[PDB]
Swiss-Prot record, chains A, B:
Listed name of the protein: Ferulic acid decarboxylase 1
List of catalytic residues: 278 (proton donor)
Taxonomy, superkingdom: Eukaryota
PANTHER family hit by this protein: 3-OCTAPRENYL-4-HYDROXYBENZOATE CARBOXY-LYASE-RELATED, FERULIC ACID DECARBOXYLASE 1
This protein's UniProt keywords: Cytoplasm, Decarboxylase, Flavoprotein, FMN, Lyase, Manganese, Metal-binding
Binding sites annotated in the UniProt record for Mn(2+): 164, 187, 229
Role according to the record: Catalyzes the reversible decarboxylation of aromatic carboxylic acids like ferulic acid, p-coumaric acid or cinnamic acid, producing the corresponding vinyl derivatives 4-vinylphenol, 4-vinylguaiacol, and styrene, respectively, which play the role of aroma metabolites.
Primary enzyme class: lyase
Organism this protein belongs to: Aspergillus niger (strain ATCC MYA-4892 / CBS 513.88 / FGSC A1513)
Record-listed E.C. numbers: 4.1.1.102
NCBIfam families reported in the protein's UniProt record: UbiD family decarboxylase
SUPFAM superfamilies noted in UniProt: FMN-binding split barrel, UbiD C-terminal domain-like
Binding residue positions for prenylated FMN: 164-169, 186-187, 229, 387
Family according to the record: Belongs to the UbiD family. UbiD-like/FDC subfamily.
Length: 500, 500
């Protein structure tokens, strides 16, 4: 099935009339990514580049925009739904509920199988050269060719008890090394730290590209510390994932992975990394810093291997649809587990996924007999002191009338119900997300502060209940009249389809 | 011409295929406004209600949505352009430049003519009853029938030197009185205050509905204290406006006004006023307060008179397209006159026109050798201590790459370049706009504070120049490549018209 095998997922996008196969030569130097960028800015069909200039020994084709948006509202999130076995018309609430469903289920550990498509071909350390592959230059000022934008890093705690799957960017350093981001509080960093404190060896590592779609979704979600993503994906899908052992180490990769790199993440070496055109929509030319260094010892791959690529930047791509929404999902759950009356959470695209809107059950709120200043503090302490809140700099509290999955309604509530200053609490003594330009390239500490809880609950929502009606068609006219107007609309001469 | 005569303006909307004439009976009790509300929420054609239940002695037809948006991007602002003799494809910059153009021109005083269409019919104090006219109930919880949503109040200083034209709401109180908002710092209030201090008589008043479109645009703009709107409209249009004297007082109304009320604004009496479904998108049921009271002594009107109506509320209507944009225009000019390097200003619809984005000439800024904290303070002191800043609670400073007329780009800049708290200055000791829910129905003083300058200029924009490129199709790919991609777009299989 498409959610459990990336090749099958590509076929599903075709069947959905959501793929464009480009069979003529395309340059991995900027051209593939430029096509992908336009797709993402216009919600077009995903591009599959089957003829990539420099493709050598079956490595590789590229699929862009794997988790980006479709043009119609009816199946807007269809590509995400296709990651998860959901109907293509699934709502974001349905997608995020699916991604949270495993959080109160027993893990279903993976099943080891003796082989799989990812072993169809191999290159040893004398046979590959990462500088000779058709690795894309994704943005014109990037500091390297970013091979790794939509694969899954696999690292395990020294004691063997936790195996983490996550997305973090990496670029080619030389024929057999990558550099990439390994930054706190991310789990690849937490595990790295464990190996560095033990001080004995580099971290055994694999990076698997074109993994089961349900696995790359969990890879992009801040599920709890110490939780093995494979078992969470198993529980979510109702099926044990099939994994094969790496050839050169004892980690386990999805059997149907398109491309697998095996090697080590250094506990001592660094190399130049970045800059990279990033999720908030910017690149700072020449802004290179030392990053984590990976050694690649072996490559295995499927016949006619396909590399997924996220051509991230301005709206809308995987960095918004997945990073933002999946953080929001975890935050929703985290608030509920802390006895806060939050029903829904989403990171508005309009905020460049730097805000999360929290919909409040105001009946519950009223029973708490609290105030804005107290509640704002409680909510921000829960979220901004937790890893799930890392990427999010503004929380917007809204009452039950607001659909947090509709950015227009979040912006309306924020703009009209939250008094600047008085209705907000700033948080300076929390971890900040340095990738946001106003952090890493801003006026203050790159790694600390710059966070805020903005209360767009109105005063009576804490006391006696909502005391307004919207000045809109829905709320300022009785039902019988509204329906009469709608029924007579085209007849009178005005203009009107859901699908389209 | 359409900009100088409301009847001609209605004909222009027809010719533009931007009118729906409804010739079957429509109830002024909510039905007309419900149709108007749906038009405004969907950017449909303006409705002209030619058969209004209760229309008596030629009073009246209704035109809704006179200054609202059209559906296509090419002539989005066509109805505003039709107020001003501009091409229907005029940009907002072009519209606001037209509205500012008279600010460095000599006024062209009005011309008195002996009669006009507004004298075709008359009703004395024994012949009309405002409770018997088809005055609309615009929102189901309004506290009265709001006759006055798009007419022009006309009041003159006691000394005769300043005659102000402005829009302020008013509702029917009884057979021969209205109540309405007369609030500081508005010019109707400033003039009222002058008459109250002189203490001798009620304020001679007229309210003219269906006035020259160029006059209702100026009516909605905070041009300076002491400036007679008629002369500013004269200068803007290049033509002296033709005015006729009122029958029962010595004020002068546009000759082609559809409907004219003549009477007095009391210096002593008040009456219940509101609530009203307002520009920020809300109504607070039962929230009635004492407002200004008007006595009507005489009504004159055109044959087949047409009452314009603004069915205001959630996006998008005249309260957003005119209040917000025309305040932004005046603010732009005010900043420039105070030697601040502002090139453009607009109130994003997404902010419910409570923000104004100020585009900065950063070459000029760099020459000033200043800082964010200093510049933010200077800009907020200029704007928030002036009447032009009254309605605006958040100013967003952006560099030259941002098109402030594009809300998506303002939201991107705000969300990614302004660090909450550190990059902002709050203003508590300025006049606030009580209509905003978080003010009048909020946690703090209804009339004071709640304002903020948010600096979305990046640090190097003050020093050495922009130091990023956007991670977008426009900026992260060379020209030759971009054009190749666009030229091959449909050929490869992707999808694409300006008008649609
Ligand atoms: C979907 C997606 C997620 C991420 C990234 C991208 C995509 C497409 C890149 C295009 C590669 C851009 C890059 O900046 N990137 C990225 C990243 N996290 C980082 O630490 N480092 C990164 O370079 N995340 C987010 C992380 O995947 C999540 O925060 C996840 O929660 C981490 O897993 P874990 O540590 O919770 O197990
Ligand atoms: C276009 C437009 C403007 C306004 C209004 C409306 C429309 C459609 C209503 C639908 C009637 C809603 C109402 O709240 N309203 C309104 C109002 N100003 C008020 O003091 N009182 C009001 O009730 N303005 C704004 C003012 O017209 C401007 O602020 C103008 O600047 C004033 O002129 P002046 O005092 O500068 O001469
Ligand atoms: K993860
Ligand atoms: K609030
Ligand atoms: K005015
Ligand atoms: K800033
Ligand atoms: Mn993890
Ligand atoms: Mn004025």
């Amino acid at each position: 099935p498409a959610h459990l095998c990336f090749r099958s997922f590509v076929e599903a996008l075709k069947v959905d009339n959501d793929l464009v196969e480009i069979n003529t030569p395309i340059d991995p130097n900027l051209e593939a990514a430029a096509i992908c960028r336009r797709v993402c800015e216009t919600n077009d069909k995903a591009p599959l580049f089957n003829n990539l200039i420099g493709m050598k020994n079956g490595l590789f084709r590229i699929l862009g925009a794997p988790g980006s948006l479709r043009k119609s509202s009816a199946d807007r999130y269809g590509r995400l739904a296709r990651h998860l076995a959901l109907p293509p018309t699934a709502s974001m609430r349905e997608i995020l509920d699916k991604m949270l469903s495993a959080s109160d289920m027993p893990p279903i550990p993976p099943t080891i199988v003796p082989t799989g498509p990812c072993k169809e071909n191999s290159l040893d350390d004398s046979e590959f050269d990462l500088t000779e592959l058709p690795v894309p230059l994704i943005h014109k000022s990037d500091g390297g060719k970013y091979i790794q934008t939509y694969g899954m890093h696999i690292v395990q705690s020294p004691d063997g008890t936790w195996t983490n799957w996550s997305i973090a960017r990496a670029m080619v350093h030389d024929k057999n090394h990558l550099t990439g981001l390994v930054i706190p509080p991310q789990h690849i960093w937490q595990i790295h730290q464990m190996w560095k404190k033990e001080g004995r060896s580099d971290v055994p590592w694999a990076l698997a590209f074109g993994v089961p779609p349900a696995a790359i979704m969990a890879s992009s979600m801040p599920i709890p510390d110490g939780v093995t993503e494979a078992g969470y994906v198993g529980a979510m899908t109702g099926s044990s994932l099939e994994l094969v052992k790496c050839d050169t180490n004892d980690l386990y990769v999805p059997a149907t992975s398109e491309i697998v790199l095996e090697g080590t993440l250094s506990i001592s070496e660094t190399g130049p990394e970045g800059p990279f055109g990033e999720m908030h929509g910017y690149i700072f030319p020449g802004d290179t810093h030392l990053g984590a260094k990976y050694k690649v010892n072996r490559i295995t791959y499927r016949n006619n291997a396909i590399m997924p690529m996220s051509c991230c930047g301005r709206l809308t791509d995987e960095t918004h649809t997945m990073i933002g929404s999946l953080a929001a999902a975890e935050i929703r759950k985290l608030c509920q587990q802390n006895d806060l009356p939050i029903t829904d959470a989403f990171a508005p695209f309009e905020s460049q996924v730097t805000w999360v809107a929290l919909r409040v059950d105001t009946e519950k709120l009223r029973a708490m007999k609290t105030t804005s200043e107290g509640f704002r503090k409680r909510v921000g302490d829960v979220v901004f002191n937790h890893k799930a809140g890392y990427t999010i700099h503004r929380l917007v509290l809204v009452g039950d009338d607001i659909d947090v999955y509709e950015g227009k309604d979040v912006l309306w509530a924020f703009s009209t119900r939250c008094r600047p200053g008085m209705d907000e609490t700033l948080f300076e003594d929390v971890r900040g997300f340095p990738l946001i330009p106003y952090m890493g390239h801003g006026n203050g500490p790159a790694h600390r502060g710059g966070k805020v809880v903005s209360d767009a609950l109105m005063p009576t929502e804490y006391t006696t209940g909502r005391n307004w009606e919207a000045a809109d068609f829905n709320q300022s006219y009785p039902e019988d009249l509204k329906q009469k107007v709608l029924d007579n609309w085209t007849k009178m001469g005005f203009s009107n389809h859901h699908h389209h």
